[PDB]
Scaffold this active site. Structure first.
Site, mmCIF file in Angstrom:
data_model
loop_
_atom_site.group_PDB
_atom_site.id
_atom_site.type_symbol
_atom_site.label_atom_id
_atom_site.label_comp_id
_atom_site.label_asym_id
_atom_site.label_seq_id
_atom_site.Cartn_x
_atom_site.Cartn_y
_atom_site.Cartn_z
ATOM 1 N N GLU A 12 -10.353 -6.942 5.690
ATOM 2 C CA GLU A 12 -10.342 -5.478 5.950
ATOM 3 C C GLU A 12 -9.539 -4.617 5.325
ATOM 4 O OE1 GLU A 12 -12.418 -6.963 10.394
ATOM 5 O OE2 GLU A 12 -11.272 -5.123 10.268
ATOM 6 N N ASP A 117 -3.347 -0.520 -9.433
ATOM 7 C CA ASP A 117 -2.823 -1.249 -8.254
ATOM 8 C C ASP A 117 -2.532 -2.726 -8.261
ATOM 9 O OD1 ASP A 117 -3.644 -0.988 -4.488
ATOM 10 O OD2 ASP A 117 -1.469 -0.923 -5.590
#
Ligand SMILES: NC1=N/C(=C2/CCNC(=O)c3[nH]ccc32)C(=O)N1
Ligand SMILES: O=S([O-])[O-]
Length: 257
Positions: A12, A117
């Site tokens: 998630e 990232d």
């Protein structure tokens, strides 16, 4: 849904494990609720990508307010969970993971994409423990028709981010991904992050620029990989080692057990 059963939460928005009812084939499904341009760029970037150390893109369907990206399932999970706190992992495992992470980053950069990232949470492992770079959510084109553009948007994750990105109005994309690969290597070898951010305001970062390697992240590392980290974690992005030179480094080329 629809064809595939969504069988367990993988991380998630949410990534589901999807098992094909007929064939038994597993893939990961990333679900992004457009009501809850970043997703448009992400799908768009993913369709450019084809490499054994990047998470495979299978396609997307848009069923209403809900995007579903079908992506290679990596059943080994996150690199992050192979890093034992305060310990890291065996040096030969860190080296092989680093090699594969470089193969993936060389590939991205060669097609003019910057990830922006890179961190162990985004570095996934397949069934044979091969690393794949995942999540092109923050990725962007830094070279087009062979012309480089400098980046201006500050993004990523503070502990991984290069210091120029906090200090410069514009900066080159490739040295930022290199730096973050160095912090990932530190994390692998020491099982801890060297600093909250590479700032003036940050004690541990000042300690490193002053070369206090008797201090903690560094004293667990060992002189050959540590010499490489000295070349990657250089504050000035123009003096920072590039990837062709990382490939020539002595630890990088050391045969390990
Ligand atoms: N950060 C990130 N992880 C992604 C996936 C999708 C790629 N494959 C996976 O198995 C997976 N397991 C856990 C998360 C994922 C993803 O697409 N972005
Ligand atoms: O300490 S830095 O200059 O590698």
């Amino acid at each position: 849904v629809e064809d595939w059963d969504l069988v367990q939460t993988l991380g998630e928005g949410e990534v589901q494990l999807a098992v094909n009812r007929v064939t038994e084939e597993a893939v990961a499904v990333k679900i992004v609720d457009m009501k809850r341009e970043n997703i448009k760029k992400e799908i768009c970037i993913n369709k450019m990508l084809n490499h054994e150390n990047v998470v495979k893109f299978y396609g997307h369907r848009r069923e209403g307010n809900i995007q579903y990206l079908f992506l290679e399932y990596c059943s080994g999970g996150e690199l992050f969970d192979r890093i034992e706190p305060d310990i890291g992992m065996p040096e030969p495992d860190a080296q092989r993971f680093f090699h594969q992470l470089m193969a993936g980053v060389v590939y991205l950069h060669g097609i003019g994409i910057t990830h922006r990232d890179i961190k162990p949470e985004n570095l996934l492992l397949d069934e044979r423990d091969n690393l794949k770079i995942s999540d092109f959510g923050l990725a962007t084109v830094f070279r087009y028709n062979n012309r480089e553009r400098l980046l201006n948007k500050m993004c990523g994750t503070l502990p991984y981010v290069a210091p120029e990105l906090l200090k410069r109005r514009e900066f080159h994309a490739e040295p930022v991904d290199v730096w973050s690969c160095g912090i990932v290597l530190t994390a692998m070898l020491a099982g801890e992050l060297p600093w909250d951010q590479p700032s003036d305001s940050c004690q541990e970062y000042s300690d490193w620029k002053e070369k206090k390697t008797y201090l903690n992240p560094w004293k667990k590392i060992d002189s050959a990989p540590l010499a490489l980290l000295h070349k990657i974690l250089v504050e000035n992005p123009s003096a920072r080692i590039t990837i062709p030179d990382i490939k020539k480094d002595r630890w990088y080329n050391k045969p390990l057990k």
